Design a binder for this molecule. Sequence first.
Ligand SMILES: *[C@@H](C)C1=C(C)C(=O)N[C@H]1Cc1[nH]c(/C=C2N=C(/C=C3/NC(=O)C(CC)=C3C)C(C)=C\2CCC(=O)O)c(CCC(=O)O)c1C
Ligand SMILES: *[C@@H](C)C1=C(C)C(=O)N[C@H]1Cc1[nH]c(/C=C2N=C(/C=C3/NC(=O)C(CC)=C3C)C(C)=C\2CCC(=O)O)c(CCC(=O)O)c1C
Lengths: 153, 160
Amino acid sequence: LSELRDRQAIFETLVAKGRELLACDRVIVYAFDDNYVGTVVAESVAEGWPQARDQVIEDPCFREHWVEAYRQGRIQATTDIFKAGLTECHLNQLRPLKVRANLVVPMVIDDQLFGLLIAHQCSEPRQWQEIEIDQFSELASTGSLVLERLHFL
Amino acid sequence: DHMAAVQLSELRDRQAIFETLVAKGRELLACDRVIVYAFDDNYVGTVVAESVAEGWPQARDQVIEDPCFREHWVEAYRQGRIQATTDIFKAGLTECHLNQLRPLKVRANLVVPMVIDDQLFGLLIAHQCSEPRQWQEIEIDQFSELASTGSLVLERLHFL
Ligand SMILES: *[C@@H](C)C1=C(C)C(=O)N[C@H]1Cc1[nH]c(/C=C2N=C(/C=C3/NC(=O)C(CC)=C3C)C(C)=C\2CCC(=O)O)c(CCC(=O)O)c1C
Ligand SMILES: *[C@@H](C)C1=C(C)C(=O)N[C@H]1Cc1[nH]c(/C=C2N=C(/C=C3/NC(=O)C(CC)=C3C)C(C)=C\2CCC(=O)O)c(CCC(=O)O)c1C
């Protein structure tokens, strides 16, 4: 990882390592351009589960305020999205992907947010453990160090 | 939930990087000691940080002999070598090398390089002192990932 000098290779590594790390159903990188508008840029998904790129998922074309919360280091660890008080529109974004559990960590260095590293469990609800959250978020941070290095180099 | 209050990836000071490497490494492995042996610009290495379990000797409390020049064994680590030694008294080490570790009461010895693109920042080292100990593949991978993360942050300091 530390040696990668290509954006897409980094994103695909993160996504493979993340799913391996958590043994969950899907890991995704939702990456931000300069306007903090985001797109799904990579996905690792267990066989048989829906792939993001096969769906049309609505996503408002502006930077919503949760972007700033992640930028400051918010982590979302949701055991079951149907019990978490999500908006209907948000549930509708995750429904096609058959999400139950939702773990969202920032890929951020010095308050520059490169993206979000996201895990889903689809088969059933899943309580994310502290040590999984720590390891997944260290993976995000390492990926972020190498994304940032791209600019320097 | 929230990212940790201090992150290795957010450190912007050399010595802080070494001290968090050594704290996190000893917690990861639950071993007796973790050190960083860091290289200066002339490839001279120095123990710059240590985290050690209660009751075991501290590196800085000892006089450990160490040839003033860069030895040949350094190149193997620059190139990515890892040494994982279950019991240093049964590993065919030289007497002089044994005498560097005796004062620290080392039995097991794990050595991973802190290296990016052929720049060797140091070695991250773990000791078990209480008993011999066979380092597991999972431990070696995790310890080595920590070392590489530390190396990314040392490198960044140059750029910054
Ligand atoms: C519904 C289209 C929409 C309206 C209208 C609105 O104003 N905002 C939403 C619902 C909404 N969504 C989130 C959080 C996220 N939205 C994401 C967008 C995506 N685009 C995709 O292609 C995709 C498939 C993986 C998604 C999920 C993302 C990445 C997030 C953050 C991750 C997550 O929380 O799922 C919110 C904020 C929820 C909260 O934190 O309060 C809202 C209101
Ligand atoms: C003994 C003074 C000496 C002579 C003479 C010589 O030519 N080389 C040695 C013995 C020797 N040491 C190593 C490898 C290491 N030596 C280290 C130096 C240290 N300085 C310290 O303060 C200290 C306390 C922690 C140490 C251990 C270190 C860090 C190493 C690498 C890590 C390890 O292997 O313990 C060698 C090379 C042996 C090999 O790997 O083939 C030799 C011959």
